[PDB]
């Protein structure tokens, strides 16, 4: 609270100083003009506003997908208590979406001829999986490239509510996810470097050392513009580093572009 009022007000002294919001973590994102600027800001309030909110470092996204497709995972439901004997079974066939640009990274085609599954239960099977998109059974994370097809089902004629079928999708989704091995992905950053003439050679080091792939290398009269994509996670602190090795005669522009299949060495880290 004494930060919300502080950094809230601390947005006026330096409108070059930014206050933000971690996606679903809400931890305040701070953007400034260098550790020097930030550090000074840290103690600028340590006593002036007594602000002891231990600012640290940013946080990753790490969304998920599936390595491959499934064949015929089936999940039924056997709650035959009596009078409301919940009974719901579906035969889903999940397929990863191949890198496209449809605003939704999802594709659900309804493969039921009806009778095998009564029609008005389409939304049920549909939203049934839609629930499991916030429970990534590795570390509970959202998934991408998800594409689901449904083969057939099963019902009981005095029963099988939406509840029966909202769960049938709820249960059998992870089944193919189990069959079709998942993977952890990360945001990849589009960077347009700018380093005069000489350090051009030396700048490539950090560009590549953080596992970044040099796409385009350009130049002009007294300047140079370089292209590459590099993971967001493995890009923090760079503002300092770039000027830390070019005599500040350099700056850059950065933006997200894509998600990719990270390696396992990376994978056994987000487990938490």
């Amino acid at each position: 609270e004494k930060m919300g009022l502080a950094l809230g007000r601390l947005a006026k002294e330096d409108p070059s100083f930014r206050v933000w919001t971690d996606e679903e973590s809400n931890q305040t994102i701070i953007a400034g003009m260098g550790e020097l600027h930030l550090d000074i800001i840290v103690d600028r309030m340590k006593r002036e506003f007594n602000v002891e909110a231990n600012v640290g470092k940013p946080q990753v996204a790490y969304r998920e997908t599936i390595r491959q497709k499934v064949t015929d995972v089936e999940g039924k439901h056997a709650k035959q208590s009596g009078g409301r004997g919940q009974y719901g079974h579906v035969v889903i066939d999940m397929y990863p979406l191949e890198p496209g640009s449809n605003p939704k990274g999802y594709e659900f085609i309804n493969d039921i001829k009806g009778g095998v599954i009564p029609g008005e239960y389409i939304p049920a099977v549909d939203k049934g999986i839609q629930e499991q998109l916030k429970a990534g059974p590795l570390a509970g994370y959202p998934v991408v490239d998800m594409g689901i097809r449904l083969h057939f089902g099963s019902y009981h004629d005095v029963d099988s509510s939406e509840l029966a079928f909202k769960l049938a999708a709820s249960i059998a989704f992870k089944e193919g996810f189990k069959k079709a091995k998942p993977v952890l992905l990360e945001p990849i950053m589009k960077v347009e470097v700018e380093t005069p003439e000489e350090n051009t050679g030396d700048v490539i080091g950090d560009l590549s050392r953080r596992r970044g792939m040099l796409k385009g290398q350009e130049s002009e009269v007294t300047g140079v513009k370089i292209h590459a994509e590099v993971p967001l996670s493995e890009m923090f602190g760079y503002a300092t580093q770039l000027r830390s090795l070019t005599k500040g005669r350099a700056s850059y522009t950065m933006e997200f572009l894509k998600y990719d299949e990270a390696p396992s060495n990376v994978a056994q880290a987000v487990i938490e």
């Binding site: 051009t200 385009g216 290398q217 350009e218 130049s219 002009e220 009269v221 007294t222």
Partner: protein, 74 residues
Amino acid sequence: AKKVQAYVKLQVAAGMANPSPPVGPALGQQGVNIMEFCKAFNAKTDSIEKGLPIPVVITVYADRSFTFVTKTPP
């Protein structure tokens, strides 16, 4: 052209213009203004045949003036 006075040694497409993207740091490596040359690059590059990769030589003084030489498309 001296032995080597920072002259580009390969080229760009015979009919294309603005050798900016592919070679990148090397064409303007001497400070060569693409402006002054790209208009004349094609002048004797569009001359024989367009689009068939030819090799060109552009050797620039410190007094900033080149000499134009071309060789056989590989």
